[PDB]
Symmetry: C6
Subunit: 265 residues, 6 copies
Amino acid sequence: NETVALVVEATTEAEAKKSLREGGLVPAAHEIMIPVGNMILAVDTQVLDKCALALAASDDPGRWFAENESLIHSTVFAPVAKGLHRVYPLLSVRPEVPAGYEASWPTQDHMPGLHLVVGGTGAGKSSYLASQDLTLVIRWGEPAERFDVEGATHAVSDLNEALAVAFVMARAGYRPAIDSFRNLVFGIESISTALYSAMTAINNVCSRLGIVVMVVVNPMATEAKAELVYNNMAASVAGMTVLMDGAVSKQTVRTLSGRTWGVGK
Amino acid sequence: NETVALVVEATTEAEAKKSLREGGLVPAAHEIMIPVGNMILAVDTQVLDKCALALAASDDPGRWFAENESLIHSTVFAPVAKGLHRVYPLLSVRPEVPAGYEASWPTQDHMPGLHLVVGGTGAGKSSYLASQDLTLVIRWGEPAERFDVEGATHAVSDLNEALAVAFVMARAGYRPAIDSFRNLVFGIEGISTALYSAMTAINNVCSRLGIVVMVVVNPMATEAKAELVYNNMAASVAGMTVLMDGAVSKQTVRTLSGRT
Amino acid sequence: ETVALVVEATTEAEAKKSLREGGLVPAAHEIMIPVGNMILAVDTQVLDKCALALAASDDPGRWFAENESLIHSTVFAPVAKGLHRVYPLLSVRPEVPAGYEASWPTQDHMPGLHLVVGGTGAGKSSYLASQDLTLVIRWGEPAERFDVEGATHAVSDLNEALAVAFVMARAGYRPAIDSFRNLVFGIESISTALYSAMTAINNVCSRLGIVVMVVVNPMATEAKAELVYNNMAASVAGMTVLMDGAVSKQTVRTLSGRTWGVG
Amino acid sequence: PKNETVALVVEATTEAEAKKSLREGGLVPAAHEIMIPVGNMILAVDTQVLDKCALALAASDDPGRWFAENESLIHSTVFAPVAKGLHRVYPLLSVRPEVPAGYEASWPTQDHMPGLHLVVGGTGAGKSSYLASQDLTLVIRWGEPAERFDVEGATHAVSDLNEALAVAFVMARAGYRPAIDSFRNLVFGIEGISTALYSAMTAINNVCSRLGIVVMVVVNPMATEAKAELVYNNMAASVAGMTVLMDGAVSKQTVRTLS
Amino acid sequence: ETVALVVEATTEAEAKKSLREGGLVPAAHEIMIPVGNMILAVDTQVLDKCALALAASDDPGRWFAENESLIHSTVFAPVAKGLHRVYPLLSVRPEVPAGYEASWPTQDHMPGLHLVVGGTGAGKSSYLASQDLTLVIRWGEPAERFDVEGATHAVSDLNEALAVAFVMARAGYRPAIDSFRNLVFGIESGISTALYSAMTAINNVCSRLGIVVMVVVNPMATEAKAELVYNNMAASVAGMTVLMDGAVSKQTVRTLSGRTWGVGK
Amino acid sequence: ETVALVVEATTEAEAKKSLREGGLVPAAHEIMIPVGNMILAVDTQVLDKCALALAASDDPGRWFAENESLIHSTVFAPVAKGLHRVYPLLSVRPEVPAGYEASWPTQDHMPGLHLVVGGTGAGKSSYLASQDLTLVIRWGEPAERFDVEGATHAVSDLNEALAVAFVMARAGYRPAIDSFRNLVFGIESGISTALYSAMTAINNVCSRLGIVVMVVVNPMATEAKAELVYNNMAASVAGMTVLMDGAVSKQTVRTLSG
């Protein structure tokens, strides 16, 4: 099979042992669960590898995503079965790196995971992305602007599509950025500590996949409370770059050999 | 004759695959989902264009409007299926612009989206609207005034109707405004962040439709935080005009040659 | 024709019926009133039957006690659960009947609510006595001498209170509600849901072309008191503020413009 | 039998069943049923059972013995209807402010409106002490730790709000003088104090008003002693009479009268 | 005669059965105990049966271990869901059995709870060693030396902590419970007022049973709010002892004849 | 045997079955573990089968690698929904098995948790490297160099973290969990008292099993409230080591000598 169950979930033990795609409660070997707030998502790494080969084969990345909505919705989806929260208590994603992983981008020996580009409104976050040699920017949760008609972009509607597009692109060897996680900052309630654990979750999926995804985050903190929040975000992900008035004031990165620190301002 | 499912929703995988209109969980090509707070509405762009074309092509567009209010209103509805929050997590609306879009109103090269007219009580908002040469003010969630009885006005009850009339009018080439988003401010909960993403969602529906809709918003903000609210609201929408004691005190707009 | 109380629509055919019958679609003579997380409905045809029957008798007070079953049919709470989803952020549309005229509470007073506001001891009873009311509808306040002696009708819930005021005002009589205390206490997180609830009730009055005077003690701090009063004023046709027995402030939306009285 | 028991679990699922009494599992009160909203709860008093009890007590040769023998019947005066749509059907429910014809009173003060008479104050203010002066028939003891008095006084101990209201209503209709010590579980159980406490007391006050009785009730609102005056004013704004105690003396008495 | 665990009344005839059988009406020998948003029940008929068996046993500690089943039948949580509606604002009624006498914990001590109160390190558990207790019931505390060498009985939940105390006291023994830490932590609403009503409820069951149960309680109050919290606690129970630096700094007890007070440093 | 995932007890006869089978009554070898509003269960028979196979194995290393799935199944979450009601305010019995003795982490250390506590940067992972551990179990932390090179086992949820720690320690090895970060974040209400009772619960399971498990906890407290928090945590567990600026600033331990 290749479709995702949307409304029929397991009611018997036999059904409960099937894959998340088929409405059961047990991930198949190629399914990875991604907890985000009170939601649970799943990535199917077989469909992901099939999409990554197809993408790298085509003569247009932007055009490929627009005409393959259906495989994108098989790549990352929200399992229908309701007992997942109970069966996997305090679920995270396990910190694990594929063998032979290498990276020169965003920085040398960058651990796979998330690289956050953070700062208040107007810090220069989008001007920062435009100098990182992205293949395209995945646009999510932000009001349409000039860049959306002129730049190398692909617009998405929900977190499944944002993650899926970033995953397929990076597995095909391209460089994605997501602009932005605004809806995750606003959507996760009761700043919430669940935001930090969602970021570790999404980080460690990129880590298991051997990729780095650049992600813009405006955390909506006070000056007073900006330092707290930035230290907690840093402790949650592979890399974080703080922007202030166009320039990097602070950077922290986990690498394959240790850690690197950046102080500007 | 194929109406909107109000109570029966998909129980099987095969029903789950149908359109939101029919009670499934998968948008049809012409359905756009609109997340507002914890609500999910849907615009049917085929019903939308049907209505907008009948309006823009009429010899008497005012009469066609009057005779088809119910049809116009059915353009936006609330899907019945319950798992939509799960299937489309942290839903927003795609930021994209139709090919060949151009605009002169409310300013030159205005990005499609919302244009917010903001301010506190008495700042002169209704006086600013009378100067924008609008076709129609859609009146929602405000107490009946003299305007509601003798102005170029159309009164609605809920958000479905308010967006529907704004969408149809603007697609038919007219200039609509909504007075006001009062019930979003009060109904969604120094103010609720869900208000900002609701405005981005509605902004991007307009952006996808290549239209501009002008909307009145009283954020009901203390004078301290009022500057920070207005900045958060500007970062959510295409354009915003602040009023302070009868005068335009600020205007920021994103355009097709760069955000002024 | 009776109001459905437990059986609601479970099929699309049933859902097309009126609110009275358990459906999700208002008949032409049904108007929905959103109040907090509640949705009520007024049946304008039952309202008009009641308003004619009440104008026939000589005793407005006695008619209401002997017809509890008709007013519970005038304003009721629909049983169907999906109304919140189907009518998102519901309000009531601001519209006016053709040929509406009013000399009371003020000249050309827009139809809607007239709020009489003030804290405890602010002069409320005195002010209603000066407005030549048919009778005061009493709701959610402790019984006092006035309930024994004065021209009153005592109700229990918000349906009854709106029903009685509606039938009275359409029958030409002149009602006041004392008070919206349970609406101030029952709608909270005071909640901005209180302001939209009064806009809703206000525009129901304007669609029926009536004015209903209503006592409200929003009961907030002096500091935040004037901010609350302005928000209430922005929600309704008219508002009168009492303090120390005297009218401190009045705002009225009129058939021409806006009236600002300040004492 | 079948005329006197309350639906505990089965509620109306048809329109014919919904039209029956609250006792029977329906959603429309009988002529003799008064709904009492307390917080998010809805109780009901059956005035017909209440008057059975009050008359048999007031007319008995030995009212003490009749009480002792009919406690379970007395307690069944107030109950909690089983039907779920009541909150929807009766939005923002209160109780009708209304006084029977020919009501007169001398206690607790001359011409005291029917309703609640609150005895309020902080921990140790002398509240239970002040009851000994009001020359009472019975103190109904609810939600308080057992003490001497619960062994040697004119007391009736109860477990829940139904029983407490039931005994106070029956006693006061029989012409006696009851007091509830106390509404502590009202204050705790209803979420500086909740406005729902104020509307609860108005509701219970207006039941007493409709029955032409006065019931004396002890209430410690647990207020900070900065905000206490504001609280005491809101409580007095909700009931017929209020008496505050500080350090063992009456420091304020406000009472609504038939004049 | 066993405890219904999952099947509750669905007919009126079933609803009139006892709490044990899944009904909504206590038998004559059943007392409901409301605790927070929970409702427990003691079966005084099974209680008396156990107190006779325990009294005729050599080893109290060893008897309790071999009788988990009789204990779970002595205090339990009824399965029927409508109890909160049927019994609004439920408490336990204050009444005292005929012919009740007490010399312990003090002379003429009212039946009820005797609270041993303090902050961390106050000497609470050392005070217990001087009250000359049959056995300490250990609940919700990390295991320590005393659990290996001491006269203890370890339990897991509030039912068995109350049951074991009830059976011991009714058989003439002296129970202390160390501690009510999980009430303080478990009961929500500077501490929750529902804690005070829970203590009154448990107090008055003890009262109705004609027993005294000693209970260690750390209310976790800021030193600001300590005298207020202690005063609310004192007003909720028969007796309370406050410890500071190993010594009794405050005491209050309701007796059969009046009130007693103690003041230390 | 296999664990009931979706079908729970509907009759009194089913309700009396084990937690594994969808019932509401623990078997003799099932210990319930309340953690926040969750209730887990450890099956000590599966636990001891796994521990024995590890401890008896010629190459314990490859037995672990080949049997991860089964080890993880040592701890599960019962499907029966009435557990909270039936076991009000659930904790774990404070008991110690007979003949328990311990040389590590300190001499005569009570069985239970040994918390390694501090703020970000305090030096905790470096203190783990000095404790002579068999395995660091990595849970809820972003992937690091350590997760590529070190003596490490990565897990996804609290069931797996507890199961690997229980099985390793029962087999005679020294496990540590890095870290309880998702307990701190996930059990909410300067922090929820529920975190403290969760640690006592897990602590007493370790006590009943006669083991010590070392756990890293960053409670994310303000500098002011820090000492108060650290005091509350030490009151909840067997042992606690506080780290500041790379060094051990405090260590309290409950002992058999006591």
